């Protein structure tokens, strides 16, 4: 889901309003199951972060797609 890692090191959830006010980038973290193997010659003997991806608003990854009217009024986003 969309998140923000600050300068001190704390990472919390991000909303588009605070994203516009803090001049941040509305993105989400991306991980990949990286598998490693060692062959010795066919003799055979991790969730790594790869980067952030900007998320479009009103999308299945953004928080606002599942929000209702009153919930959008709570998040200070016009319906």
């Amino acid at each position: 889901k969309p998140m923000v890692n600050e300068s001190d090191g704390v990472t919390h959830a991000l909303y588009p309003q605070e994203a516009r006010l803090r001049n941040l980038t509305y993105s989400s973290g991306l991980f990949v199951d990286v598998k490693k193997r060692t062959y010795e010659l066919k003799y055979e003997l991790g969730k790594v972060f790869i980067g952030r991806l900007p998320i479009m608003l009103r999308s299945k990854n953004c928080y606002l797609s599942e929000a209702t009217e009153s919930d959008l009024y709570k998040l200070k986003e016009c319906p």
Binding site: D8, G9, V10
Partner: protein
Amino acid sequence: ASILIGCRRAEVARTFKEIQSLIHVKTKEFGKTLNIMKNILRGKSQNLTYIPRFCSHLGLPMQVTTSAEYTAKKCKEIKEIAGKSPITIAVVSIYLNILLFQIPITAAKVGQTLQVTEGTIKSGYKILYEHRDKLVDP
């Protein structure tokens, strides 16, 4: 050592085992190079920040974070043991502040996540439980 210096100058907190986990500097030569480097910086003329980081590693609420802040400062004022490196004081402080509430992590999970000995967090939890009196914020 330059990364650690740039971390100490920017009011950031990074443990020696973290940079050591990044770079294998063999600790001892790292300590000597960091010492003579500090002498270079002095010739060219704070554990509290660690609490929110480990609380982020455990995913704890804000009340436990500021509770471990007040507990860290008070434990810094009470003396006895003084510290034995501030990392163990941080992990036993968070351990007490989390045994005050109901969120369960036990000692094995917090000992394998923060890379701290269970006997050390229990050894500090003993005298900490002895000083439980004056550590209550509300």
